[PDB]
Design a protein around this ligand. Structure first.
Ligand SMILES: [Zn+2]
Ligand SMILES: [Zn+2]
Ligand SMILES: [Zn+2]
Lengths: 130, 130
């Protein structure tokens, strides 16, 4: 059965993501209920290629947290998953950055440099400043 | 006279940024009142080196819009301002990303790539997935 094999893969995925540490607190994603077993789904694209879908909820709805958790899920799974896979990840809510936090971001040199190196963003800017 | 040379400089800065196209709308920042003449301040850090401070307000408080306006201001003045300067930008409210927009972000190839290359974020991620 496709369906039961997909449930086996979802448990494998979950066993790898549960012990990822939160970007902010000294606890695991599982401990803080950012992820749980039911938040994973696996689908077949074609033999030898699976799509993994992970829903998660950061401890508070802040953009930088959501970004970082997304990065950790990809890094951990890319390194540790023993089958070829596409990954899609979804948060269940909008997020925000406080006045203080967004001003930090738009002035932080590392953050500015990374957006500048994004070819999609750099082209939008190119076209605004002409 | 320091004070008045600073006003001259703030008018030169303003004249450059007011014609920047908004990232989302078919208008300039000045038309949309994202910036105005009094939102620019210039200070002396020392001879041949001025701090330029720009306050702005995006048409709506969304993170991507604030990020892109910030980039455009920086590139514009980098390319056109005929004096050595440091730039600080400030938005006077927090911002948010809808559930739709934050999901696009955490799945978008270039956004993930750029974040991974930001040294602060990559070191955090390393520690979280170790
Ligand atoms: Zn908050
Ligand atoms: Zn945000
Ligand atoms: Zn909104």
């Amino acid at each position: 059965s496709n369906a039961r094999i997909m449930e086996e893969k979802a448990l494998e995925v979950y066993d790898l993501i549960r012990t990822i540490r939160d970007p902010e607190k000294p606890n695991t994603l599982e401990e803080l209920e950012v992820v749980s077993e039911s938040c994973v789904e696996v689908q077949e694209i074609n033999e030898e290629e699976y799509l993994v879908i992970i829903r998660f909820t950061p401890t508070v709805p802040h953009c930088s947290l959501a970004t970082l958790i997304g990065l950790c899920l990809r890094v951990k799974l890319q390194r540790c998953l023993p089958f070829k896979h596409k990954l899609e990840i979804y948060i269940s809510e909008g997020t925000h950055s406080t006045e203080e936090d967004i001003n930090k971001q738009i002035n932080d040199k590392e953050r500015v440099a990374a957006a500048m190196e994004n070819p999609n963003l750099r082209e939008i800017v190119e076209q605004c400043v002409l």
